[PDB]
Structure 1
Amino acid sequence: PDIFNRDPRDHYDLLQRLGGGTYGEVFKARDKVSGDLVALKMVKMEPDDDVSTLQKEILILKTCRHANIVAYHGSYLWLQKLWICMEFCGAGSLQDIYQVTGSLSELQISYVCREVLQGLAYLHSQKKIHRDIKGANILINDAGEVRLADFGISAQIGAELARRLEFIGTPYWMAPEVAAVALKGGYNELCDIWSLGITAIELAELQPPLFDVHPLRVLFLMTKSGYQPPRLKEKGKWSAAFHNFIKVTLTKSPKKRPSATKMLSHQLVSQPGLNRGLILDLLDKLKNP
């Protein structure tokens, strides 16, 4: 992996802040000569970080190439700030879209779900977990194509990791099994399938289930023995295949819950007429209400 030890401000002009958090910032940026629009993700680098692990993580981003995953172009390390140059998605997230357009149609949701599953089946074949499938992390380009934004780079380095360590507290008295869970958590690969189920409801209804209920209460209810997975609110609005998609994706037991490959053979996402045109209609609704 060629991490360029140079200022990215020489190569790109930063236009507009798209978003950010503790990890750092993501900008819309223009290439100075070539004129390509890119997404430039600034990641804050703390002084006692392994450069070898950073190299392995950028190598993981370089090797992770797939149509439904946002493309990696290159890296810059300059003044304890890692910059990751990526594919720009000009319509933002599905969240940004649905907040203006209102709820997606069933065919639109079916197309989105197929493309996310294609993305997830690839990530799971590489022994990765997305960990955060939601409307806000599914990006849409001007062509109506679907890309997953991958925030996994911030987990292994920088301020997001430093904040995770502060929350976990001192580890010196902690047992191996407790340390294992502090790093990993409950995240396995099939948790992304659950999250997609919730996302499909989110796109259908403008909120995930229990969005107005307090988060601790939701967490307690999810962990009970007789917890009932959520459902679509209106039954008649949606077809039997869409209800079944939600039913199988929201299987409570991880052992019984179907994989991304399994889900790609489901009726909802395997039907004909699912293409980017459906999202071009959505982007037209956004522009001309």
Structure 2
Amino acid sequence: DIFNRDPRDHYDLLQRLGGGTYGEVFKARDKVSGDLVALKMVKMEPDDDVSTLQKEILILKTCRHANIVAYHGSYLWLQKLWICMEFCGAGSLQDIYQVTGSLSELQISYVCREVLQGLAYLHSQKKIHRDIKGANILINDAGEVRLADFGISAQIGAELARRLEFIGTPYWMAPEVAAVALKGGYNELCDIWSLGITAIELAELQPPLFDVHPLRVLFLMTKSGYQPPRLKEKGKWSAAFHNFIKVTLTKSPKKRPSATKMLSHQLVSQPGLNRGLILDLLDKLKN
């Protein structure tokens, strides 16, 4: 499952694509097949024994779904874990919309249906993604939609930095998650709220309150009279899209629908939602 060797023995390392709390990601090519892959270098905590690491790589391998970037293999080299993953040629939805402008309502509907399929799978596996946003939804050259990873729950690498990252950028978290360090916990329904915010982000190029200081957003979201956000231009979007935002952004998690329930919402169950809508979006990159 995990190779005790240099990933460079099986791959040619190419350009660094980006990096964050999840690791450093590079473009790479398989030496034998010639196929493009993404190699992600994750620094390890010296306290995590190889049994702890193996338990997490087994999860990385078994927690599999068509709407989550596929895992190919791993390498333990120089106290670092290199993860080989499916190459998503068009980058994230943020990378795309910061060139193309706002996605169409049908494009957002397709993205939302595909992300809901991935979240319904992760929730069935008793995981909470807790990192849904446009930058963490990747697009391949075929127009397919994939979550970059299964979220923050990997008990390897910079887990603590990943877990606390939203405190400095809380715009996509549900109010029960924004109530950080208070007695109430949260459940998987926080992902449904994050998907509602991501739909507004795809429509408006930023999530609601993006211009507000992160500590002020945390202050506002724990106030009793806090109201969920809405789309800015009412006449630009259909009643179905406004209702999708209304129900995904239900303030109380005890009233917020599940990922499976959301899949029958009119916005994402309508006919004509396919990768061709995203192929049209990728065609806009050329102009």
Q: Deviations over 1:118-165 (max 9, x none)?
A: 000000000011111000000000000000011647852234447879
Q: 1:154 to 1:76 in 2, by over 3 A?
A: farther
Q: CA deviation at 1:226?
A: 1.2
User: Matches of 1:49 and 1:168 in 2, distance apart?
Assistant: 25
1:110/1:167 CA distance change after superposition, 3 Å: closer
Equivalent position SS for 2:74: strand
For 2:34 and 2:173, the matched residues in 1 are separated by 52
For the structure 1 residues 33 and 182, does the alpha-carbon distance in structure 2 shift closer, same or farther, using more than 3 Å as the test? farther
8 Å CA contact 1:40–1:86 kept in 2: the answer is: yes
Where does the alignment leave 5 or more consecutive residues of structure 1 unmatched? Answer: none
How far apart are the structure 2 equivalents of 1:41 and 1:209? 31
- Find runs of 4+ consecutive structure 1 residues off by over 6 angstroms: 162-185
Pairwise CA distance, 1:173: 32
Match of 2:258 in 1: 259
Q: Which moved further from structure 2: 8-17 or 140-149?
A: 8-17
Do 2:137 and 2:145's aligned partners in 1 also have CA atoms closer than 8 Å?
Answer: yes
| Alignment partners' CA distance in 2, 1:238 and 1:171 | 25
Distance in 2, matches of 1:179 and 1:285, equals 36
CA contact (8 A) 1:43 1:154 kept: no
Distance 1:121 1:174 in 2: 18
- State the percentage of identical aligned residues: 100
| Matched-pair contact (CA < 8 Å) for 2:152–2:163 | no
- The equivalent of 2:23 in structure 1 is 24
Specify the SS of the correspondent of 2:224. coil
Match of 1:119 in 2: 118
Deviation, 1:69, is 0.7
**CA pair 81-183 structure 1, distance change in 2 beyond 3 A:** farther
Work out whether residues 23 and 44 of structure 1, in 8 Å CA contact, stay in contact via their aligned partners in 2. Answer: no
Against the structure 1 CA distance between its residues 48 and 232, is the aligned structure 2 distance closer, same or farther, given a 3 Å change threshold?
Answer: same
| CA apart distance, 1:65 | 1.5
Task: Quickly say closer, same or farther: Cα 1:177–1:262, change in 2 above 3 A.
Answer: closer
What is the deviation of 1:171? 25
What's the C-alpha RMSD, in Å, of the aligned pairs?
Answer: 5.1
- Of the structure 1 ranges 201-210 and 25-34, higher mean CA displacement relative to structure 2 is found in 25-34
Whole-angstrom distance in 2 between the partners of 1:102 and 1:195: 21
My pick for the range that moved more, 89-98 or 53-62, is 53-62
The number of equivalent residue pairs is 287
Gaps (5+ residues) in structure 2? Answer: none
Q: Report the CA distance shift for 1:5/1:125 in structure 2 as closer, same or farther (over 3 A).
A: same
Contact 2:92-2:136 at 8 Å conserved across structures: yes
| TM-score, L = length of structure 2 | 0.90
User: Cα distance, 1:186 vs. partner?
Assistant: 4.0
TM-score (norm 1): 0.90
SS at match of 1:192: helix
CA gap of 1:232–1:102, structure 2 versus 1, over 3 A, is same
- Rg larger in 1 or in 2? 1
Maintained 8 Å contact 1:131/1:187: no
Instruction: Summarize the alignment of residues 40-119 of structure 1 with structure 2, pairs less than 5 Å apart.
Output: 40-119=39-118
Q: Is the 8 A contact 1:155 1:161 kept in 2?
A: no
